[PDB]
Design a binder for this molecule. Sequence first.
Ligand SMILES: Cc1ccc(NC(=O)c2ccc(CN3CCNCC3)cc2)cc1Nc1nc(-c2cccnc2)cs1
Ligand SMILES: Cc1ccc(NC(=O)c2ccc(CN3CCNCC3)cc2)cc1Nc1nc(-c2cccnc2)cs1
Lengths: 301, 301
Amino acid sequence: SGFRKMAFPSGKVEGCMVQVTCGTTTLNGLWLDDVVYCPRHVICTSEDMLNPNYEDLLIRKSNHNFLVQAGNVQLRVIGHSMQNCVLKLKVDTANPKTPKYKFVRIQPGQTFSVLACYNGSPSGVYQCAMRHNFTIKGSFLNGSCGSVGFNIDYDCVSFCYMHHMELPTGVHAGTDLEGNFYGPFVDRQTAQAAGTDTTITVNVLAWLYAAVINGDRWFLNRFTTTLNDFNLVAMKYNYEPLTQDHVDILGPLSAQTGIAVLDMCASLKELLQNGMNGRTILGSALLEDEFTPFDVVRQCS
Amino acid sequence: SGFRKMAFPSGKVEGCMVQVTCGTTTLNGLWLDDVVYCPRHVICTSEDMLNPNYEDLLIRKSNHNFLVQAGNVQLRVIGHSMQNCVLKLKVDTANPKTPKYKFVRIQPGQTFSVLACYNGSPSGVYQCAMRHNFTIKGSFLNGSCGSVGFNIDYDCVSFCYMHHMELPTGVHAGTDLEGNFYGPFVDRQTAQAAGTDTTITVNVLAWLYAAVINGDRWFLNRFTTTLNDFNLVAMKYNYEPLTQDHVDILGPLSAQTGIAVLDMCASLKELLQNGMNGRTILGSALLEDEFTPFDVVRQCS
Ligand SMILES: Cc1ccc(NC(=O)c2ccc(CN3CCNCC3)cc2)cc1Nc1nc(-c2cccnc2)cs1
Ligand SMILES: Cc1ccc(NC(=O)c2ccc(CN3CCNCC3)cc2)cc1Nc1nc(-c2cccnc2)cs1
């Protein structure tokens, strides 16, 4: 029983975090086999900032300009290359703690764990969702660039996010581990801002099912709606439209509770139109949308 | 920027989790040096449950009755003893991954990270607070007993909680690592239930300061209250009384924001008496009380 924001155990990732220094700039790198991955803006200098050309800047670098530190051990850089917005630094030592891993790009609405690091040292772990506008609402201070986001499937770490920057509204933007940004953002100083966001409807429904699994039932009703009439109401409250595929994904939770998806949608419609009226669901006074159907099944069978 | 429920990196603890089996009962143990620690009710059998005597039950056990598995390796038990409500199993191998550690008992209102484990394998990590009634609102399924709660200070793990049981309202109860229960609970089947709880006032104030540090300011006011008139209002809403020591602990946050503690208390008083009126603070629609002043300073300078 109970339901918490839960992250994956971070040990497999902690053994991969290193510190990368270029001149007076220090951030975090990810050390897998004989390669270190880090944000390319580590080579940015002062009088660049505005309109940098990273191709020019990297051509002017030498291997000895990059200082890589794995705890108290310095790693010798023997090659370097640009991988879109990430730098690949070949080192003379393969990481003995390299886990089984994959580089995977996630979709809006999916969740992952973030290991926040400073100076190559892990600081804390938390759980995030990729928003509809391709930002994440993280917790990051200056020096956290290069921190990574990940999921774990059995023994294999799926890396999906490297942290690059903070936007004016305090939300965060980054790339996959191939160096391709999530969303329409660039690693330089522009007036760029996050687009509009929506609520992840399938996730809210998943969380209502977690509530019922845990004994919170006050929001349930005898009513059932159609998928069409539900989406009419969802647009008014800036929820994502619900599709038949979302209904299928909620099948297992629907079977376990005996509550059909379209019956739970009639509860969500009433909560939107009336509010909670002073009550809470799973300790929250608003509808939470950062738990996937998978997160729910994993945490509370 | 940003503020998240954040747990400590769990790698140092993951390397200590093992699986302990007695007969048909399997749960989690903590392997430090040449000792495994686990809940003593692993020796409970069926026709005991009601009124067990653990002294009798342990006298009837032999070392070979305990099967300890560290991943794919079986550890040989060479001694056993009762430590209040925890069992100490001496094994023939010292854990090569033993971190620097301490056994520390925490106070209500303090927080810690929980590494939930099943069959000796870590499953997820999350952050908890010890409540005023000595329960924690965790996320635990059958088989999670022996999972531990901890904090990390530099390189040293302070273990503070081992999980033992779930209470009827779905909250959780356990012991420190010396085997002494938090609160008036026993490891047997009785009608025991959690006592009444209060809101941790110093933590709510810490979280309001985190909100101001992150740019959420709508709840601020020009007013200041006395410590006496604030506590008059806190009792009506079931908040813990605020003391001068709490004011001192909030000093650093007060200095950084320029908002005196008693000025922030006049904001808390108005939120209690009027509510939020449809707005949120740090993404929450209620006042959060599971972040300590230390948690806040650590996460957002
Ligand atoms: C997208 C991007 C492009 C270029 C840079 N690098 C710079 O702007 C930069 C690099 C080097 C210098 C020169 N030195 C100045 C003195 N300190 C050492 C560096 C000055 C500025 C950083 C970023 N990303 C950043 N993310 C943050 C940040 C803040 C809070 C939370 N998460 C990320 C600050 S900067
Ligand atoms: C406090 C306590 C005292 C004694 C026991 N052990 C038993 O009740 C017990 C032990 C052995 C057996 C016999 N076998 C029965 C068939 N399965 C194997 C065991 C039957 C019952 C467990 C506990 N603690 C428990 N915590 C949970 C629990 C559930 C969900 C989340 N967190 C903890 C279930 S039981």
